[PDB]
Design a protein around this nucleic acid. Structure first.
Lengths: 342, 355
RNA sequence: AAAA
């Protein structure tokens, strides 16, 4: 754990995981032209860990120049260890060659099997779960900004989602548009919202508060999904479970409905339905695909959870985009367990 | 010279992975006698994409299974390949680093040629001798899409040029007519002026009431043209001009791209330096207040172009209407080139295509 | 093709 040599590239996670697990004295970061901002991401991700960071520039596609930099590093730090997981194959082949020639340890992080491979001796080790959500987001340039009676309604809405589909969808729309006075047919649902004090009659009905409006504006379903994951957390080791995280990189901001870490992979659920004529899921699928790839990277996992049934086309695009889909709140607990395992 | 290497070296060994392009480009350029495809478990569909991409160039194809994360086992398979085909050449661009390190090691030990495809500089690097060669441009749009499992399914030119040149001064009038055309509102008002005279003279609008208190489109094709179609033609016509000096390939408008499960419509696509270029230039999504809302379009561009064109694919968002700072910042964040100033588009297209 |  003396000197750790990392090759920086699009995905910093496999360089950061070993440094958080077992802090070395020194990290040598091999960065490439126009990517010095990756050095700053690496510092931000490892801020919690006292460690000296040395930066060295190499060309992504120059075998000989990478061989020369590794030779220089091994002269100055003979007890160096190489993380060969990052970089181009040119960078990685060059560095492997010089570290092998000097009989040095060489590690590769396999996130599929959650193992560190020791390429020098063929051995391996299970990874821990060292990452927080803060550290994971930092690797992608992102930082975070941010009643008893109503939980009962949330469970009844979830259990009755098929038969109250249209009424709840319509109330979501009304709440989204901030339409101050609205009609609702007499029935179990109107009685329930009146008894729960979510709606009151107009001097027609109105929401009893902005909080009540937010709750009917798909807020109930966001809390339902979060509350299933708190239950599931009791039996599966989900980490850093958070609702309504607001993340920025200084150029864009994204809101994420529910996020957690499991086996060092960020899991993102989209379960706000207030984007979307009705509800328009196609615009939501494109957003999930775009944002989750930028925020959670290639090993990140995305789910689209809905109280309203999705069309065949929407389900086919989700399958095509590797987005797990639940449009049956009755089945969500079982589906969350299936998704998390996988 | 790659044609030369494939006369002396009969057998091309490549490692299959998410991006088949760097294995396919050398095979289309210079067809070898035999290809050995190293595929991994649950990814036999990559063998089928490779066959489909190289259908125009039938060779002998041998398939061999390897584990993505087993160094010693990949070393043994490469040893076996080199025993049976001693004149093998390795394309080390594909695969995991474990696959690639294992194969490199055995091919280096046997003093074999080893190539790596650099799409940034458009070069084949010969890792055995430090030499390199410019790639050609034999790749078609059909072959490119096959690597990602996809298949491809009047008087008014004067008006088009005047709209492009006057986009700043007619911004609001043209935006408003785009909205009307999008909503299919059949009868509309227009202030008297240069623009009304132009549309009347071009026969794009005709009067609908006396005293020109109302107008209508002269046809559905006239409506389509006012529904941002004029700007789509402007963009395509800049690419025809540029084609006269730059080797843009397979320039297409309004392409339908499908796999088994999804279809995507794309405004303008071409190949340049073996990279797929996608332009979004359709104006058809408005709010209730008639403003364009670009954010939903940016997410679609980001999602579709990454699936259809892969990580080296290039996307641009072109508009005649000014975009908000936030929309421009999301485009920058998502590596989408953005133009909201038709006066600058030619220069921006040249910058974009040359990175 | 810069954790495949």
């Amino acid at each position: 754990h003396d000197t750790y040599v990392c090759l920086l590239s699009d995905h910093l996670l496999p360089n950061v995981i070993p440094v958080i697990q077992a802090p070395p004295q020194r990290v040598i970061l091999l960065y490439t032209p126009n990517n010095k901002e990756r050095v700053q991401r690496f510092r931000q991700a490892t801020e919690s860990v006292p460690t000296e960071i040395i930066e060295k520039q190499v060309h992504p596609y120059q075998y000989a120049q990478t061989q020369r930099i590794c030779d220089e590093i091994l002269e100055q730090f003979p007890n160096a260890i190489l993380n060969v997981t990052g970089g181009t194959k040119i960078m990685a082949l060059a560095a492997f060659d010089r570290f092998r020639h000097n009989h040095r340890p060489i590690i590769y992080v396999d996130s599929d099997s959650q193992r560190i491979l020791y390429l020098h001796n063929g051995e391996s080790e299970r990874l821990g779960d060292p990452l927080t959500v803060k550290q994971y987001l930092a690797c992608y340039g992102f930082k975070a900004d941010n009643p008893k009676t109503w939980r009962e309604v949330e469970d009844l809405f979830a259990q009755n989602s098929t038969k109250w589909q249209n009424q709840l969808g319509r109330l979501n729309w009304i709440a989204a548009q901030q339409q101050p006075i609205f009609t609702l047919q007499t029935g179990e649902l109107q009685d329930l919202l009146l008894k729960a004090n979510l709606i009151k009659p107009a001097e027609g009905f109105q929401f009893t508060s902005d909080q009540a409006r937010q709750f009917i504006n798909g807020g109930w379903f966001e809390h339902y999904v979060y509350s299933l994951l708190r239950q599931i957390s009791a039996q599966y080791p989900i980490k850093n479970l958070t609702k309504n995280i607001e993340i920025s990189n200084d150029s864009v901001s994204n809101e994420l409905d529910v996020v957690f870490l499991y086996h060092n992979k960020l899991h993102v659920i989209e379960c706000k339905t207030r984007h979307f004529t009705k509800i328009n899921p196609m615009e939501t699928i494109y957003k999930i695909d775009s944002v989750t790839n930028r925020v959670a990277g290639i090993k990140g996992k995305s789910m689209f959870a809905s109280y309203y049934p999705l069309t065949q086309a929407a389900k086919k695009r989700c399958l095509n985009n590797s987005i797990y889909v639940s449009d049956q709140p009755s089945q969500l607990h079982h589906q969350l367990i299936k998704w998390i395992n996988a």
